[PDB]
Structure 1
Amino acid sequence: MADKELKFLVVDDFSTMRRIVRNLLKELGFNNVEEAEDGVDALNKLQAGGYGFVISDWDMPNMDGLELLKTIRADGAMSALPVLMVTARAKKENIIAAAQAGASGYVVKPFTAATLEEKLNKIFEKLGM
């Protein structure tokens, strides 16, 4: 995956979290990044088209990460979009629910650029990108 212009949507209700993830992506060379504050905001943005990767918080108001993921996977145009879930604490049941709903990966925050890079690269490889 040599497309540094892959367009990311970073979804989290905390502005600081979104900024952290944006800055880590920038460090890795991914600068084509947009932000959303909950699952509905995310879906509104995704409808505009052109997105290549979603990084979403698990716990958000109004529409949480699991519901956002399910909606993406049920969308014809976006059904195969990579979705990496972010959580403050790994839990077996959450990991399995996310997998059942089609998550591409799951990562615990706080994380470093090297940790994000490994998550992204393993997802790109798994998906044949």
Structure 2
Amino acid sequence: ADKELKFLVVDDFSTMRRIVRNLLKELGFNNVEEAEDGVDALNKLQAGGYGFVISDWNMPNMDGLELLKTIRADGAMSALPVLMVTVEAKKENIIAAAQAGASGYVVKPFTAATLEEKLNKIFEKLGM
């Protein structure tokens, strides 16, 4: 995929945002911005130009599921890829996220190999 693709990494733990940013850097993606919850993410998305969102689930103010539903419902960004990356591992969470339009799902903790794979699967599926 295009190495200039612009990512938004959303997670309320700065520890986790840094981890994702660094793995993406390792894979060749340097165009990365950050948000600390769903409200903040929606503010940043309106700056335009974003091509991919990686989102946590548990966050204050607006959680990852609500963020996902908001993205899918808005004509400006309804086809934006959204990869969930979260501690929530239960079947019910995986099902709810998929039903709400998630592009993929990763359970923390995860390796760079898992991320590259999860990312690639989405790139192929969407023709990116």
SS in 2 for 1:48: coil
TM-aligned CA deviation for residue 111 of structure 1: 1.2
Counterpart Cα distance in 2 of 1:45 and 1:74: 17
1:31-50 alignment, distance < 5 Å: 31-50=30-49
TM-aligned CA deviation for residue 128 of structure 1: 1.9
TM-aligned CA deviation for residue 89 of structure 1: 3.6
Counterpart Cα distance in 2 of 1:56 and 1:20: 13
Counterpart Cα distance in 2 of 1:87 and 1:37: 14
TM-aligned CA deviation for residue 73 of structure 1: 0.5
- Look up the match of 1:13: 12
Counterpart Cα distance in 2 of 1:111 and 1:17: 11
- Structure 2: unaligned runs, 5 residues or longer: none
Counterpart Cα distance in 1 of 2:64 and 2:101: 12
Counterpart Cα distance in 2 of 1:45 and 1:114: 28
TM-aligned CA deviation for residue 86 of structure 1: 1.0
Deviations 1:44-64 (A, max 9, x none): 000111000000001111100
Counterpart Cα distance in 2 of 1:20 and 1:81: 22
The answer on whether the counterparts of 2:57 and 2:88 sit within 8 Å (CA) in structure 1 is: no
Counterpart Cα distance in 2 of 1:70 and 1:89: 17
Counterpart Cα distance in 2 of 1:121 and 1:91: 24
Counterpart Cα distance in 1 of 2:98 and 2:57: 13
User: How many residues of Structure 1 are paired with residues of Structure 2 in the alignment?
Assistant: 128
The answer on whether the counterparts of 2:3 and 2:28 sit within 8 Å (CA) in structure 1 is: yes
TM-score normalised by structure 2 residue count: 0.97
TM-aligned CA deviation for residue 114 of structure 1: 1.1
The answer on whether the counterparts of 2:55 and 2:83 sit within 8 Å (CA) in structure 1 is: yes
Counterpart Cα distance in 1 of 2:36 and 2:120: 25
